[PDB]
Design a binder for this molecule. Structure first.
Ligand code: YMT
Ligand code: ZN
Length: 346
């Protein structure tokens, strides 16, 4: 019922909580890079962005993939919304102390992402002497390979400590779950701008995940004792692992390339909004809770609808982001695993 799932989670526990020297290796590369970066005229205000710190992941199946975020404090920033995309913006400056650190990447009044990534990647490429990966880039920006296994996706982010853009006004619908006072508190935190043709930056709220995952119940005491243990975290882990295993089962094909743990996180958090009560997430009901996550995500692929959790009008499952053929393929593959007691969980 929930027995196979529990054992999958027991297997996953014996690799994470099991002495992973991987994170400590990643930390050493990042510390060395930040020191070099802070000596540059444009990157003197650089710093590690805590998304769980150095050990921020994507791959829950294999510790062979880490995702790190660097932040740059960009003050008195003016944002121009590109083509009413709601998520993509141009970065312009108020121009008070004109000769500012990032004035070297300006193309008129607009701040260039490719030219900022150019210097960033160049400084990292020479600081390596750990192997770099030219491959594609863009987003995730720099991709390093520690030894022969560990892969680290470094993303540079513009930090704005001002009110969140108007596109987010109806996003973060946590009022009936985490409360209206928590939503207000989270919305006082900064927002980030990441690169990815035009020199546009998308809004990133990745730092908010940790805030919510570590304090995820309607009850303030959720998972702090015996009678209040919920399966929300276990459902997220199983949803991530499902996509990761499906992405392995078809790694010789192009169909599941556009899908990430991000699509899985977003849909999981929309299930959280839909099911705000801790009783809708009981440990005993792990099987049905996971099914709700699986069902919601299938209804997402089928309708080509998965709204950005912070930007309701930005659709992560639009035809311009992922095609019908890739959505209809993953729909069949999940429906298969669901109708066979999940074979990837063997
Ligand atoms: C309640 C809640 C909070 C945050 C997110 C979220 C939001 C974003 C974003 O960009 O907006 C995310 C982007 N990554 C991938 C990533 C993360 C760190 C470093 C590199 C790459 N993971 C995210 C999670 C979601 Cl979906 C829900
Ligand atoms: Zn809980």
């Amino acid at each position: 019922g929930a027995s196979k799932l529990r054992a999958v989670l027991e297997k996953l526990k014996l690799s994470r909580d099991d002495i992973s020297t991987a994170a400590g290796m990643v930390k050493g590369v990042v510390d060395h890079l930040l020191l070099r970066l802070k000596c540059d005229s444009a990157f003197r205000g650089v710093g590690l962005l805590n998304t769980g710190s150095y050990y921020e992941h994507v791959k829950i199946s294999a510790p062979n993939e880490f995702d790190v975020m660097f932040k740059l404090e960009v003050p008195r920033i003016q944002l121009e919304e590109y083509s009413n995309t709601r998520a993509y913006y141009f970065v312009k400056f108020k121009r008070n102390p004109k000769e500012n650190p990032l004035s070297q990447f300006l193309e008129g009044e607009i701040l260039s992402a490719s030219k900022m990534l150019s210097k960033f990647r160049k400084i990292i490429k020479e600081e390596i002497n750990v192997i770099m990966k030219r491959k594609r880039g863009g987003s995730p920006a720099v991709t390093l390979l520690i030894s022969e296994k560990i892969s680290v996706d470094i993303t540079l982010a513009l930090e704005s400590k001002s009110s969140w853009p108007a596109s987010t006004q109806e996003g973060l619908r946590i009022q009936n779950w985490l409360s209206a006072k928590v939503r207000k508190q989270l919305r006082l935190k900064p927002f980030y701008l990441v690169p990815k043709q035009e020199e546009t930056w998308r809004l990133s709220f990745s730092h908010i995940e940790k805030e919510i995952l570590n304090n995820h119940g309607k009850s303030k005491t959720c998972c702090e004792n015996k009678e209040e243990k919920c399966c929300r975290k276990d459902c997220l882990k199983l949803m991530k692992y499902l996509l990761e295993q499906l992405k392995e089962r078809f790694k010789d094909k192009k169909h599941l390339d556009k899908f990430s743990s991000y699509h899985v996180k977003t849909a999981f958090f929309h299930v959280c909004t839909q099911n705000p009560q801790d009783s809708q997430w009981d440990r005993k009901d792990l099987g049905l809770c996971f099914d709700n996550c699986v069902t919601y995500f299938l209804q997402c692929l089928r309708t080509e609808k998965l709204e950005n959790y912070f930007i309701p009008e930005f659709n992560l499952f639009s035809s311009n982001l992922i095609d019908k053929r890739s959505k209809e393929f993953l729909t069949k593959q999940i429906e298969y695993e669901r109708n066979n007691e999940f074979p990837v969980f063997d």
